[PDB]
Amino acid sequence: TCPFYKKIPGTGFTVDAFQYGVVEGCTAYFLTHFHSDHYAGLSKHFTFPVYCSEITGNLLKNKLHVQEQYIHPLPLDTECIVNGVKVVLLDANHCPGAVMILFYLPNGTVILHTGDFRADPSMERSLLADQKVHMLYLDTTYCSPEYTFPSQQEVIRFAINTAFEAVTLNPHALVVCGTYSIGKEKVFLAIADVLGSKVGMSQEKYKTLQCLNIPEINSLITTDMCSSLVHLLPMMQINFKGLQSHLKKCGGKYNQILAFRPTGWTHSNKFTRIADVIPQTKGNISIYGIPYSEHSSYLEMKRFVQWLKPQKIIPTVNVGTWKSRSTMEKYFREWKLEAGY
Numbered sequence: 588t589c590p591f592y593k594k595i596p597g598t599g600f601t602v603d604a605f606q607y608g609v610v611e612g613c614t615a616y617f618l619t620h621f622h623s624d625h626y627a628g629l630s631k632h633f634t635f636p637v638y639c640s641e642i643t644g645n646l647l648k649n650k651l652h653v654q655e656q657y658i659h660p661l662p663l664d665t666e667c668i669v670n671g672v673k674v675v676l677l678d679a680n681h682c683p684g685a686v687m688i689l690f691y692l693p694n695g696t697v698i699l700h701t702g703d704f705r706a707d708p709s710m711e712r713s714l715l716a717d718q719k720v721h722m723l724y725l726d727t728t729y730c731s732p733e734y735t736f737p738s739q740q741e742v743i744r745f746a747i748n749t750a751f752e753a754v755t756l757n758p759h760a761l762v763v764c765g766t767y768s769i770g771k772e773k774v775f776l777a778i779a780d781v782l783g784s785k786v787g788m789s790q791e792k793y794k795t796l797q798c799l800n801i802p803e804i805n806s807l808i809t810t811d812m813c814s815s816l817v818h819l820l821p822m823m824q825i826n827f828k829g830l831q832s833h834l835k836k837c838g839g840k841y842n843q844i845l846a847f848r849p850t851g852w853t854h855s856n857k858f859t860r861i862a863d864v865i866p867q868t869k870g871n872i873s874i875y876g877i878p879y880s881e882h883s884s885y886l887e888m889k890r891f892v893q894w895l896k897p898q899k900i901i902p903t904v905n906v907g908t909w910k911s912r913s914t915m916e917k918y919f920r921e922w923k924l925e926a927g928y
């Protein structure tokens with residue numbers, strides 16, 4: 588049965604609620620982004636209206652074979668009417684095609700559902716600025732002050748400089764980047780660009796990337812591994828055994844691997860600066876864990892909420908334990924008292 592925090596009151600709407608069968612009284616199902624915990628349940632047999640971004644709708648059609656007649660893509664930053672309710676989709680600064688949803692309820696309440704997001708000051712100048720929000724359904728993934736990480740830009744600087752140094756020192760080194768879902772494409776695209784290479788990957792991953800409207804993509808990715816010195820692999824294969832095996836397969840073209848695992852947060856964040864990150868090494872294989880996050884840090888989340896001044900907050904992440912719920916509720920009260928709303 589669908590949890591309350593996926594239901595939008597005063598409407599026929601649910602958000603990211605595809606794994607509960609037919610939800611009683613749901614007339615339209617919204618999907619914020621194409622990550623499996625959120626799309627779980629969709630397939631070619633789905634026959635209710637799905638509302639989403641253009642990019643999300645490309646993925647639904649091509650990867651999950653959802654029939655076109657039930658996909659309703661909406662433009663961003665545009666007031667649209669769905670089953671008689673005004674809605675707007677806003678960029679969530681998460682993975683490609685990820686949105687936040689503004690609902691303008693018939694009785695005058697305004698509700699923001701962030702989906703998954705990485706809050707940014709740039710959001711303070713979208714259509715959010717123009718009216719009051721009463722209820723906020725918030726991505727609280729990293730809602731605790733221990734969760735600090737660098738900007739995306741510092742993390743990509745570190746990766747580019749690391750890769751460029753290594754390959755310039757040894758032109759027979761291969762760079763490998765791990766992936767398991769869409770998101771974090773900048774990691775592998777920036778490394779390939781500095782090295783003057785295309786990124787090589789499986790046919791299934793190339794298919795996924797071709798749905799994302801990234802400019803000049805035919806110029807940056809390929810399925811011809813032999814012509815590429817930056818290879819993408821499943822995140823599970825980013826370990827010494829899996830990488831030793833891969834290196835075998837390249838037929839003596841390469842004699843060293845430098846690999847990157849983009850994680851979100853890891854406890855080496857509470858001690859070490861990005862400048863100071865070092866790899867795990869075994870033989871001719873090294874592995875860097877880099878803290879490339881597509882969710883808000885604690886400080887970014889705090890700033891956004893203190894800007895928005897919602898009357899009520901509903902967390903959507905970490906809701907399963909009383910200890911987490913109590914922690915989060917204590918931070919929301921602090922933020923409210925400090926800012927004065």
Ligand code: NI
Binds near residue numbers: 703
């Ligand atoms: Ni996500």
